[PDB]
From a paper:
NHLRC2 (NHL repeat containing protein 2) is an essential cytosolic protein of unknown function, mutation of which was recently identified in association with FINCA (fibrosis, neurodegeneration, cerebral angiomatosis) disease, a multi-organ condition which is fatal in early childhood. NHLRC2 contains three domains; an N-terminal thioredoxin-like (Trx-like) domain, followed by a six-bladed NHL repeat containing β-propeller domain and then a C-terminal β-stranded domain. The N-terminal Trx-like domain contains a CCINC motif at the position of the CXXC motif, which is characteristic of oxidoreductases and commonly involved in thiol-disulfide exchange. The six-bladed β-propeller domain comprises six NHL repeats, a structural motif originally identified in genes NCL-1, HT2A and LIN-41 and shown to often function as a protein-protein interaction module.
Crystals of the longer NHLRC2 fragment (aa 1–572) diffracted to 2.7 Å and also belong to space group P21 but contain four protein molecules in the asymmetric unit. However, in each molecule the electron density for first 9 amino acid residues, the loop connecting the Trx-like domain and β-propeller domain (212–219) and the fragment between residues 345 and 354 were either missing or of insufficient quality to allow the chain tracing, suggesting flexibility of these regions. As expected from the sequence analysis, the structure of the longer NHLRC2 fragment can be clearly separated into two domains. Consistent with this the Trx-like domain of NHLRC2 displays the common features of a thioredoxin fold, containing a central mixed β-sheet surrounded by three α-helices, along with a Trx8 family specific 26 amino acid insertion comprising an extra β-strand and 2 short α-helices inserted after the second β-strand of the thioredoxin-fold. There are also two additional N-terminal α-helices which fold over the Trx-like domain of NHLRC2 in the crystal structure, forming an N-terminal protrusion. The CXXC motif or CCINC in NHLRC2 (residues 89–93) is located at the N-terminus of α1 of the thioredoxin-fold, with Cys-89 and Cys-90 protruding from the protein surface. All cysteines of the CCINC motif are found in the reduced state.
Author numbering: 9 to 212, 219 to 344, 354 to 572
Write the structure that this text describes.
């Protein structure tokens, strides 16, 4: 009745596939595995989808035993917060392009939420558009199917035969070789038996910004750099809201050169200094450079594909990186490497980082984080762990001399010392370093405070405060790092949009990042799912929408 049933047989197949020298040997072994599993007396039948769950990218609900007979089916147990699930989506996209509904394959996303916020249908509907998921989707918010199957990992794939008989499970990310081997040979087998039908299954506004991930402010000239993630472009905008430069879009890409030529792929982090913007070009797995004087884009880090390198050390364009989410200047570029749960550095000029030797110009490496997904604090940077670090902010002045890290999957904020690299707790989470489920919405001191998937931090040098974009609680919070006291600055915690209002009566919706102005009078917020930049006046305590024209 559970995925336990496949484990002795499928691991016996996987042991043979490692001694298999030819692609034909591997194909015949998988075919022999399916002869065995198909000819079992008692199928490991999938539970039916619970009735009255909400479905996306379909006309009506889908049921395994009325609508998916005669089909190979890939269930994707996933949640949109998890970077491991995000990394899998390109592999499912490539599978759907290879094998249509007509060819006998359907993929179903069984959205099984980690966080409370992701249970809300409209927040899944946004995520579907953000990540461009064009296959059927079910909001299994209580995670009934997950708990019945004893799924234990985000993501889990479960491949079904034509009568809902479970054939394979693939746990986690980057099993593209096996996903293709298993589904291709599953189709081949059941087509040779004449059990795969060729029937169809039914599947299904120009604003100026579209899901803006991040924003930053030039200290000298008070211009905004907005990552307009959904339009796959960067905007340079004056303080009054007039657009100076639009760079990229409307389509994805990796193209360098002039600004009509240039293209990005869901950019998040942006930083600026001396007319040079660095972009964390997240789904390209690249750092890009925009030169505003020369009016040219170039690539400074990443090879263009998802790294699994946890150590690094190569020069820029020969160093694989994994889903860079935020960037800030330090002379160095600090990088929140969400994909490998680490803080990285690109050395813009040749220099030396805390607890390492001199490194040459262009060297791209890990600074902090083991690479394990953990809420682990440590005096030694390598032995500490992060959990999808998505925000940075530099406080270089004394007595801080630290990098503030929004650590999203842990629901904490972290300091990393710029003297000795010590990664220390600030607010949120629990003491247990393997506990990634210590989330909530509580104002308090240290571990007593609770956050929910925070994506942005910005440091106020004037007031000695940190503003946290506490994204899934739909709230800007304020942390005093001396006392470690964390409290709500603005946001009711609902998502019903409001243009002009006070801080306590204003609203946000999954704010992806934020940044303070030079003067310390304005706090700009990338209010992602409202498709808007929110300007918070810290003097009048009024929120306004930045007009863009």
């Amino acid at each position: 009745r559970s995925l336990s049933g496949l484990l002795p047989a499928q691991t016996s197949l996987e042991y043979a596939l490692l001694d298999a020298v030819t692609q034909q040997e591997k194909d015949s072994l998988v075919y022999q595995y399916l002869q065995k599993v198909d000819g079992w007396e008692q199928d490991l039948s999938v539970p039916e989808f619970p009735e009255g769950l909400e479905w996306l990218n379909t006309e009506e609900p889908i049921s395994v035993y009325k609508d998916l007979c005669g089909k190979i089916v890939v269930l994707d147990f996933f949640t949109y917060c998890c970077i491991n699930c995000i990394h899998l989506l390109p592999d499912l996209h490539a599978l759907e392009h290879t094998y249509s509904d007509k060819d006998g394959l359907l993929i179903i996303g069984v959205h099984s939420a980690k966080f409370p916020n992701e249970k809300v249908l409209d927040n899944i509907k946004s995520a579907v558009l953000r990540y461009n998921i064009t296959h059927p989707m079910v909001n299994d918010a209580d995670a009934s199917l997950w708990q019945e199957l004893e799924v234990s990992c985000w993501p889990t794939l479960v491949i079904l035969g034509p009568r809902g008989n479970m054939l394979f499970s693939l746990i986690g990310e980057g099993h593209k070789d096996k996903l293709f081997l298993y589904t291709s040979i599953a189709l081949k087998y059941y087509k040779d038996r004449g059990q795969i039908r060729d029937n169809k299954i039914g599947i299904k506004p120009p604003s100026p910004l579209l899901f803006p991930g991040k924003v930053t402010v030039d200290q000298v000239t008070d211009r905004l750099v907005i990552a307009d993630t959904g339009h796959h472009r960067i905007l340079v905008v004056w303080k009054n809201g007039q657009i100076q430069y639009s760079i990229g879009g409307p389509n994805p890409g990796r193209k360098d050169g002039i600004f009509s030529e240039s293209t990005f792929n869901s950019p998040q982090g942006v930083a600026i200094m001396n007319n040079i913007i660095y972009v964390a070009d997240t789904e390209n797995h690249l750092i890009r450079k925009i030169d505003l004087e020369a009016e040219k884009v170039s690539t400074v880090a990443g090879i263009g594909i998802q790294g699994t390198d946890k150590e690094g050390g190569a020069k820029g364009e020969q160093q694989p990186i994994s889903s860079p989410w935020d960037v800030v200047f330090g002379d160095i570029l600090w990088i929140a490497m969400a994909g490998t749960h680490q803080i990285w550095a690109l050395l813009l000029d040749s220099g030396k980082l805390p607890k390492k030797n001199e490194l040459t110009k262009g060297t791209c490496l890990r600074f902090a984080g083991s690479g394990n997904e953990e809420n682990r604090n440590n005096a030694y940077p390598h032995k500490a762990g992060f959990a999808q670090p998505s925000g940075l902010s530099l406080a270089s002045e004394d007595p801080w001399s630290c990098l503030f890290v929004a650590d999203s999957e842990s629901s904490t904020v972290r300091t990393v010392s710029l003297k000795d690299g010590a990664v220390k707790h600030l607010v949120g989470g629990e003491r247990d370093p393997m506990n990634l489920f210590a989330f909530g919405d509580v104002d308090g001191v240290g571990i007593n405070a609770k956050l929910q998937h925070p994506l942005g931090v910005t440091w106020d040098k004037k007031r000695n405060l940190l503003y946290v974009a506490d994204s899934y609680n739909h709230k800007i919070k304020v942390v005093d790092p001396k006392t470690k006291n964390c409290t709500t600055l603005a946001g009711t915690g609902d998502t019903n949009n409001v243009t002009s209002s006070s801080f306590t009566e204003s609203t946000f919706n999954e704010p992806g990042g934020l940044c303070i102005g030079e003067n310390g009078e304005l706090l700009y917020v990338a209010d992602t799912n409202n498709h808007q930049i929110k300007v918070m006046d810290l003097e009048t305590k009024m929120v306004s929408v930045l007009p863009i024209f």
